[PDB]
Amino acid sequence: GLKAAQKTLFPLRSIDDVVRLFAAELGREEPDLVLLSLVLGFVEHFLAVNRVGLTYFPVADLSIIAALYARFTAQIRGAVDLSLYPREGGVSSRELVKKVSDVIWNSLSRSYFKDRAHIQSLFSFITGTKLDSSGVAFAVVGACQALGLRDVHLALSEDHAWVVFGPNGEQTAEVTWHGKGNEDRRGQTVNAGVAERSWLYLKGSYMRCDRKMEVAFMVCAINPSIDLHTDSLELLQLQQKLLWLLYDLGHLERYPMALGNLADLEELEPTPGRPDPLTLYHKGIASAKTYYRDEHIYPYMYLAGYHCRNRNVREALQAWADMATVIQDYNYCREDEEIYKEFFEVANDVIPNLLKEAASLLEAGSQGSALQDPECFAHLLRFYDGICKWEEGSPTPVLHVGWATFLVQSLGRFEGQVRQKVRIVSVPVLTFQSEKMKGMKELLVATKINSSAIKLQLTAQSQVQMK
Ligand SMILES: CNc1nc(NC2CCN(Cc3ccc4c(cc(C#N)n4C[C@H](C)N4CCN(S(C)(=O)=O)CC4)c3C)CC2)c2cc(CC(F)(F)F)sc2n1
């Protein structure tokens, strides 16, 4: 190592002192990822993992943080001999990146629950020898910065992390695991995943972080959870203030999910004089459109969740239809199961519950109901259309009969006279991209929907029961 100028704000006695440290580091040529992650991990430990003795804020003394920092830089410098890996042209080699990955990996405890909270930071790595999946990727990047490897940067999809490096930053390397019961690909490129058009690799439209975005990542990685029913107000405030600092400096520009996180925090506890949650959700979508070809799913997911919490059925349906319009141009691959799970839960649990309450409210005489709005029926249809189109061409199927009962129920929440008002046009008006929905068209306006025919069309089931 730490330089004199990095040390002058210690001790950190409050949330605002932590914010000052982040501001000072963000003003430097390269913010120190190791320092910053150790500080966050330290305060998260004493605010969420063990609050014994807490009276206000866990003071972070320089002696304590500097000793943790020294434990990290000693391990890395001792285990990675840079002379074995000459930096050709002032950039890093694949072998060096895989060395650093191995040093982090091999340090980890032999057995632990990888799903646990509060194992994301370098504090966890040093004091518990535990990291979560993306935590390992972050740690590799922090280690490379500590070694002077300016070209190694964090790469992020919506469900995975790796690194970029090398000439023009054009190389990719896996540095951590993905999911459970997948085989390690550490050291390899991500090109096969890009080429197969999986969601996991975002068709190549993944985030390539600079150092400031790596700071944003560790701030998003703060976990305020104390338990299933309790969050640390202190950590919520810290994360919120840090995200506003990053926002003001321009470092959330290219980070859609961070904008959604900030919107969620503002919904919980609004900051006076700041943009409303909707504004922020829409900025997150705009970031995805601008920098990532509109190939990201979660910006719409964050927006839909806000509308669903506020029981705004219309706008929730629109955002989930928009969700589906992105997924339709992907192939559903091995290792995409997390996004399948989210679409499944929206289709088969969230939408049904939202429409069930809308039906009860309509019975009690609600006006302007989504259930009497043909544009809302069109959004529901567009949601299913995008899921059906996603499945086309995919190496693994999406739909099955366990989806069909919920489709029939949801369709039936709209009366036939509402459903009749949507005009399905071929290449309120809607065009279908999927063959499954094109063949379902003439079932969609009957007063009583033909449940059996819908199931056949959605699952492309060939036959009915013999007897
Ligand atoms: C912030 N930066 C960041 N975040 C990353 N991942 C986050 C992505 C969002 N999730 C929270 C989450 C989860 C599910 C969500 C939603 C929103 C919806 C909807 N609809 N849905 C669907 C589910 C079914 N429901 C619907 C109903 N709502 S409700 C009751 O509130 O109405 C609850 C959620 C959200 C916000 C948190 C984690 C990642 C991931 C990265 C990759 C890697 F590898 F690094 F980890 S980087 C990153 N950055």
UniProtKB/Swiss-Prot annotation:
What PANTHER family does this protein map onto? MENIN
**What does changing W162R do?**
In MEN1 and parathyroid tumor
Note the effect listed for A288P. Answer: In MEN1; no effect on histone methylation; almost no effect on JUND-binding
The segment annotated Interaction with FANCD2 runs over: 193-365
* Mutagenesis / variant outcome for changing E25K: In parathyroid adenoma and MEN1
Tell me yes or no: is Repressor among this UniProt entry's keywords.
yes
What does the record note on quaternary structure? Component of the MLL-HCF complex, at least composed of KMT2A/MLL1, MEN1, ASH2L, RBBP5, DPY30, WDR5, HCFC1 and HCFC2. Component of the menin-associated histone methyltransferase complex, at least composed of KMT2B/MLL4, MEN1, ASH2L, RBBP5, DPY30 and WDR5. Interacts with POLR2B. Interacts with POLR2A phosphorylated at 'Ser-5', but not with the unphosphorylated, nor 'Ser-2' phosphorylated POLR2A forms. Interacts with FANCD2 and DBF4. Interacts with JUND (via MBM motif); inhibits the interaction of JUND with MAPK10 and the phosphorylation of JUND by MAP kinases MAPK8 and MAPK10.
Q: What is the effect of changing P256H?
A: Found in isolated hyperparathyroidism; likely pathogenic
| Name of the featured protein | Menin
Going by the UniProt record, its keywords in alphabetical order are:
Chromatin regulator, Disease variant, DNA-binding, Nucleus, Phosphoprotein, Repressor, Transcription, Transcription regulation
Q: Name one GO cellular component term.
A: MLL1/2 complex
Tissue localization of expression is: Ubiquitous.
Q: What is its main location?
A: nucleus
Q: Which CDD domains match?
A: Menin
| Gene, per the UniProt record | MEN1
Question: What does the annotation give as the result of altering M257W?
Answer: Loss of interaction with KMT2A and JUND
